[PDB]
């Protein structure tokens with residue numbers, strides 16, 4: 001597209017993004033955004049909704065008051081942002097930012113489809 005392209009252009013990293021960069025889901029179903037954490041760097045990650053600049057989570061803790069969001073540790077190097085019930089209003093760009101020395105940013109586009 002170009003919505004998705006402009007979102008991926010916000011990626012700032014030395015290493016190629018090893019997690020999915022495009023997530024399509026059907027509305028009212030769970031979505032899962034994965035972020036790969038450099039294991040020789042400050043392991044702190046925050047999720048950011050680009051549309052309104054909302055800081056959703058900033059590590060193991062949630063900042064948004066929409067209870068459909070949760071952050072979890074899937075593996076030693078992979079964090080998951082769980083969107084419990086995706087709506088058409090949830091489609092758009094999301095940023096995983098790592099407080100490593102180089103300020104690594106990864107970009108994930110969520111597209112929710114409503115039948």
Ligand SMILES: *[C@@H]1O[C@H](CO)[C@@H](O)[C@H](O)[C@H]1NC(C)=O
Nearest residue numbers: 043044059060061072073074
């Ligand atoms: C993140 O959550 C896990 C549980 O999955 C916990 O074991 C770990 O200590 C937490 N880490 C931080 C940095 O808060």
